[PDB]
Symmetry: C2
Subunit: 149 residues, 2 copies
């Protein structure tokens, strides 16, 4: 129900904040009550709060250097306040080269200046080797995040 | 630009034909030059032509009974003539229960009454168990 030009500006700011690869710069575009869901539902990963996200992303971005974002497809449904992005990522990690692809569904808030809900499906076969190394990493350094992956 | 209502009718006919309610079926809504892409790109699967799909669907259909389609999200970008669907499927197969989830990206043709190309990302971890069973079934029975 937010204006389309307001939604489109948030969509671009969301992409630029993601490509900038800073926690504050990316989380600028998320509302205070934004949740993240990992798809598929069969994976059984619980919803992540904004507080979970604020702990996970600094760990993520400190371990992924030379981050590169390739935007492949953007689909914006302004009357519904929804958008979809298919993107490809790459980076260097202590665990070796990182390669991922994302299908990200977004919901804008009523004002349209923030993202209120995120559902994300990614390269699950490749990530079933990388994400557990992240969790083992967090445990070995006693970083006690209260959130996994 | 293709009208949003024309595109929406194709979107609904695509979903209804996928669920099996439409007459003329799933493939009547695709252009003659429609292709299907298996996401992610890292999987290295070449595009499936319309002829490949017409060969492939009778094999899946024969192996799948009680097919059920659950639509979770539809995102329609009428200005660009694009749409995204997130759906959940289930069926009974000779290999046991089938469970899949789909993130399907759709491009409509210029007029808007047909699907011009498809890019699909599915439950890859679960499909790594199911898809090679299909190839073994095809090979064991000397198909194609």
């Amino acid at each position: 129900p937010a204006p389309a030009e307001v939604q489109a500006a948030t969509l671009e700011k969301f992409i630029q904040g993601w490509a900038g690869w800073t926690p504050d710069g990316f989380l600028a575009n998320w509302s205070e009550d934004c949740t993240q869901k990992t798809l598929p539902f069969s994976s059984g990963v619980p919803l992540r709060t904004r507080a979970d996200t604020e702990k996970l992303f600094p760990v993520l971005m400190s371990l992924m250097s030379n981050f590169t974002l390739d935007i492949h497809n953007v689909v914006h449904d302004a009357p519904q306040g929804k958008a979809v992005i298919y993107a490809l990522t790459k980076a260097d990690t202590p665990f070796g080269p990182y390669r991922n692809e994302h299908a990200i569904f977004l919901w804008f808030n009523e004002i349209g200046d923030r993202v209120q809900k995120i559902e994300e499906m990614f390269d699950a076969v490749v990530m079933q080797e990388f994400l557990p190394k992240l969790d083992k990493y967090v445990a070995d350094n006693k970083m006690q995040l209260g959130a996994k992956f």
